[PDB]
């Protein structure tokens, strides 16, 4: 199991992009199954600094995620995450993201394309407010680099 999960994580890690691709896990999801992955990624690195530098980006795209509570511990495991892809899930409104208020303080790029929350009137305004380092939301620049240097 640990061997199988470790092998899966290795196959899904792109060193060149510093990216851990956890998209579409159901095709090879559950909070306790996700917690297990997070425990394994935490155990990989003896130095948190190396972990922080190795995994700068994560995709959780296409996982039928209804609430970020489902994958909450990503915020604990990778507090210095810079890029996050949550595209192609089913996050319906801002309350489905609010469990990550005050987390991902260093996140610079966020993708929510394909989630219903993106079409609500206060979407971009609130997401900008909640994540102070965010420069790109769905490919749209929402903070200039100088703006972000001050946020």
TrEMBL record:
It is found in: Nucleus. It comes from the Eukaryota. Belongs to the NXF family. Involved in the export of mRNA from the nucleus to the cytoplasm. This is mRNA export factor MEX67.
């Amino acid at each position: 199991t640990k061997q199988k999960l470790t092998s899966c994580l290795a196959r899904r890690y792109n060193a060149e992009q510093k990216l851990l691709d956890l998209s579409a896990l159901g095709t090879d999801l559950a909070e306790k199954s996700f917690k297990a992955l997070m425990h394994l990624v935490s155990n990989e690195y003896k130095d948190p600094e190396q972990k922080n530098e190795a995994i700068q980006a994560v995709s959780l795209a296409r996982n039928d995620i209804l609430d970020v509570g489902q994958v909450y511990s990503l915020a604990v495991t990778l507090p210095r995450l810079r890029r996050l892809d949550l595209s192609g899930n089913n996050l319906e409104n801002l309350s489905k993201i609010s469990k990550w208020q005050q987390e991902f303080r260093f996140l610079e790029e966020l993708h929510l394309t394909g989630n219903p929350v993106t079409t609500l009137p206060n979407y971009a305004t609130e997401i900008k407010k909640w994540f102070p380092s965010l420069q790109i939301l769905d490919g749209q620049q929402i903070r200039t680099p100088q703006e972000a240097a001050e946020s």
